[PDB]
Structures are given as C-alpha cells and as structure tokens.
Amino acid sequence: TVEKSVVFKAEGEHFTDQKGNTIVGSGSGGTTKYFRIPAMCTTSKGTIVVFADARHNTASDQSFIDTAAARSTDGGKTWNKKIAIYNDRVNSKLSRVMDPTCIVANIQGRETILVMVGKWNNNDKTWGAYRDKAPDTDWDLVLYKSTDDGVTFSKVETNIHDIVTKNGTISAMLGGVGSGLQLNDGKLVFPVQMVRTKNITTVLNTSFIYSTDGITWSLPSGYCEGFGSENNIIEFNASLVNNIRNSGLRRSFETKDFGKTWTEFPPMDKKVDNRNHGVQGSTITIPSGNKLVAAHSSAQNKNNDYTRSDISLYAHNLYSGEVKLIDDFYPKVGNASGAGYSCLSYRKNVDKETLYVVYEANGSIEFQDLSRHLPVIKSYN
Ligand SMILES: CC(=O)N[C@H]1[C@H]([C@H](O)[C@H](O)CO)O[C@H](P(=O)(O)O)C[C@@H]1O
Ligand SMILES: [K+]
Secondary structure: OOOEEEEEOOOOOOOEOOOOOEOOOOOOOOOOOEEEEEEEEEOOOOOEEEEEEEEOOOOOOOOOEEEEEEEEOOOOOOOEEEEEEOOOOOOOOOOEEEEEEEEEEEEOOEEEEEEEEEEEOOOOOOHHHOOOOOOOOOOEEEEEEEOOOOOOOEEOOOOHHHHHHHHOOEEEEEEOOEEOEEOOOOOEEEEEEEEEOOOOOOOEEEEEEEEOOOOOOEOOOOOEEOOOOOEEEEEEOOEEEEEEOOOOEOEEEEEOOOOOOOEEOOOOOOOOEOOOOOOOOEEEEEEEOOEEEEEEEEEOOOOOOOOOOOEEEEEEOOOOOOEEEEEEEEOOOOOOOOOOOEEEEEEEEOOEEEEEEEEEEOOEEEEEEOHHHHHHHHOOO
C-alpha cells in the first residue's frame, strides 16, 4: 500500500538471540552490518513477510549470518522485525544460515509460510568448492514454517538430507533464492541449485524438490543445466518453466514430464541481459483473464560488473515471446560488496490485486509497491 519503505536498515537494526541477549554486529552502535538476499511472501490476510540474510559483521558470504524476518500488516508502512532462523553458533566468525527461498501455500487447508535456507558452520570457502563428499559434512538445508501468519517459525523435520544422501552425486543443495510455488494440484515446489560431486563433469545443476505435505520431499530423476544456478520456477499449463541466472543472457528451460527432461523455453530464454557475473532474478506469473503473463525482476547492470545497477521489472509475453521493460524501480548503481537481488510477490485477495518487490539497496532491504504497473503487465499476452 505504501509506495516505498526500508524493511531492514544497514547499520540500523538490533536483534536479540534465543536467550534475549543483543547480537552485537559490526555496524555502528553494534548493529547488524549488512542485509542481503531478500525473499518475500504475501498471505491471504494481506500480510507481507520478508526474509533476508542478517550479515551481522560483513557482507561476505562466509561470515556470521542469521535469517531475519520482517512482517507488515499495514501495506508495507511499518515493520515488525526479528530473527526467524538462528545459525548454530559453532564458529563466531563463520556460522551461518543463508540464501532464503520462501513459499506461501495452503497445505491441506492450512495457510503456511515455508522458508528454506542453507546452513554451514566451519566452511570458509564458497560452497561450490566442496565436492569431495556426498554430501559435504558441514552442509545442511533447513526448513522452517509459520502457521500463524508469519508471527512464529518452527523447524520442520524433513527428509531432505536423506534424499540428497541417497542420490549420492550431490555435495550440497540450496533453494533457488526468492520464492518457490504451489502448483495447481496443490504440490509445493522449491526450485533448487546443486553442487555435484567431483566425479560429475557438470559442477552445478538446477532442478526442484516437491512435496504434498511439506515434510516428505522428493527429487525428480533428471537435471537441468546449471549456468549461474540461482533460479525460479513458474507453472505454465502442463509444464514447469525455470528462469536461471547466467553471466550475460538469462536462461529458461521447461519440463513437460515433471523433472525428467528439460528443453529450452523460447519465450523467456535469452531475453534479459544481466551482463557480467549475472544476478539472481525473481520470476512469477500473473493471471490475465484465462491467460498468464510472467513478471520478472533482475539488474540491468550498466557498469557490467558487481555493482548490478538498475534493478528492473520486465513483463514476458509467454505466447509471443515479447519482453518489455516495465519499470526500472531501483535505477541506481549498487554496492559491489553485495547488490542486485530482488523478490516479487503478486497476490489477488478477494478482488484486491497487489504486486510488491523487495530488493537490495546499499546494504539495506527496500520495499516498493508496484501495483500501479499491473494493467500494463496484464496486457502483455
Ligand atoms: C551460498 C552462497 O555462497 N551464496 C552466495 C552466492 C554464491 O557464492 C554464488 O552464487 C556461487 O555459488 O554468491 C552471491 P553473489 O556474490 O553472486 O552476490 C551471494 C550469495 O549469498
Ligand atoms: K559469491
């Protein structure tokens, strides 16, 4: 409802641990230093829930991180904040939970918010460097859920570690970043990225995990090419279509056999250029009559580097393959320490449609209401 607000302020937030003691970060006055990787979900009550890495000491990936959650019930004007998932606190310099992917769904009639993050404790190198073990012993992928509209989160005892181990060719797995989805048949789907074991020629692959109850998960038999691995999936008729990060042009593939084989999807394949290094992007579908339109956000990256400037909203015509820039909502050069990520959230509650975005803005996480752009996006079919 509000047009724009700051969800998490770099060097402006103070969080407390499980015992009620304040977490003294490296920010001014002992605040959390930097926020990254925003994920957002809107509920049937109109509640906006935002998750993000609370990188307490540094913006670097291998650092002390907790998953923060902010909840707004007044259209994004004010935010109630807290830590949703705490890292294990084994290593004060490296313990972390990171890269959230959320899903808002109705599981057997109960509206649930699921959040999945990767967890590490002693690894001091980038996750893609660990390929000797199946899986890496330092790694874990945890899932938390909220059944009270984002107020409290609880760990879900899942079989995810089991399926990865059983596969035997996966060193580590992570969510695609941003948001997953609930299919028409009710199944929950989390797009995933995976680092394969050393013997596999392809270092990274993309796929997804699915579940009916959110407790028992499955992995399909096939694998999609990895590229920059971060990705989102959308349901289009009887297909699952992904949108993957890649240095240069984004890639898009579709499965018509539920994860067994993937072929490039022309309407979205190589349509948006993120330039050097690539960036994570959010891709969701928006209904228009009895048709669908895909809305997407990622950085134009005008400096062709890690600054990832100009985080923009695009509309993808799934039928014709046309693409159009709808709005450059953050037309600024980002902080090379960590920038460019975003997450879109569309929802139609009763007769009210809303389109929101959450994105990285120089260490902080900002929110913008993009609903005014819906008529233009919805006409792209
Ligand atoms: C688990 C993890 O490391 N996530 C980080 C990834 C990852 O290192 C790369 O995607 C290579 O796998 O990098 C991005 P970015 O630096 O491109 O902004 C920040 C993420 O927090
Ligand atoms: K990185």
